[PDB]
Amino acid sequence: ASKDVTGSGEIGGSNSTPKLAIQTSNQVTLTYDGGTGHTYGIATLHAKGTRKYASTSNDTKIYYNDNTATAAPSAPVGTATIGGSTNWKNAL
Amino acid sequence: ASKDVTGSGEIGGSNSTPKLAIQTSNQVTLTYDGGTGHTYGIATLHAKGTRKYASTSNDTKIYYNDNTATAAPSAPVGTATIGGSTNWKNAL
Amino acid sequence: ASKDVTGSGEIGGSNSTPKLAIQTSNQVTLTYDGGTGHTYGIATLHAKGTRKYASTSNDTKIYYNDNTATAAPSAPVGTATIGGSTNWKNAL
Amino acid sequence: FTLIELLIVVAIIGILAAIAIPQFAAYRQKAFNSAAESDLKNTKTNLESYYSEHQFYPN
């Protein structure tokens, strides 16, 4: 799914899998999508911020976009880079 | 034990273990409890202050409480978070 | 050596080593001693001042003495704190 | 103690109180963005940590 988190929270747990506890900073919101489990898609946006950093398992650097509303990167289906897409590629 | 320190002082040393020297700021008091040795519990309170910051080995952020008298966090017995307790959870 | 500096000047350079340029404030005099190179000993005294701040590589805070003539801290020979000596220990 | 001096004092106070302070909203937004960056990096590290005990990412 797309279970977001802020402050302290829990991530994953479907199909009775173990769930880890993710604790972010003061008031930063994080959007997560785990897909089937092979890959992950992360995103980050401060509440009073002007950037929306995001990345993915297959990528090798953090990408940002100055819109703070560019949805979130879904889990890529196999070795698929997200740096270069329309909603991204403003490379850090 | 609960050997506190202020200014310059020494921490630990039981069972002939090596002891490190901790030097704090001007007039800030620090309360430390090392337990058996696996974990640590730290705390901090300025003399003319209005907050009592504290944390622990298993935690991932500093927690405060606006009472300046909320005892101190003892060493947790195994992967036990202190952020959420009654004397704490006013997350930074 | 004990090459002091004031205004704009140069520090070090022995044994054909690279020399950095240190530029202090308006009329503050700084006394430096680099020793062999492992450690450094710094000091500071304003011309029309009433304090002589000083520190060292192994220390963790600035120490002062209300004499404005307490020589300067030489380079300590190995992990030797200067806070506690007779010419110092008036901790900031 | 002279009415001229007090008027000059008022003028100088008015001159000094009009100093343009630096912009602060952007200054704080810098720290907010840095916090977001650090949180994302730590989240990546934690996810790769989880991928060690088991052989699949969360969910």
Place this chain on the structure above:
Amino acid sequence: FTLIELLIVVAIIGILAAIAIPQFAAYRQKAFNSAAESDLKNTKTNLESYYSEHQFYPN
């Protein structure tokens, strides 16, 4: 040089000396709390440094 002018000067001095200065106790308490915060963070770093030479925290 006129008794009216000196009285007006006294009135203006009394007006100017009553200016409400900003609160300072809280301003200094801010610095004290920041010092406490920095001390705690440095203590955490030092403890994790000690945990490298040996394999146990102090005590």
Place this chain on the structure above:
Amino acid sequence: FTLIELLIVVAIIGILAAIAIPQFAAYRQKAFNSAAESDLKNTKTNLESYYSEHQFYPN
């Protein structure tokens, strides 16, 4: 316009000109000491910066 009023004016001027101004030498010495402090801190930062390009402090 009366010799009494001018004498009272002189008396009030003498009263007002004797006001004890605050001490200024110590006030400036505060700024001098703060400058010394900042210079020492910046010197420490610069020395640790130099210790990054090479593996020894100056000299």
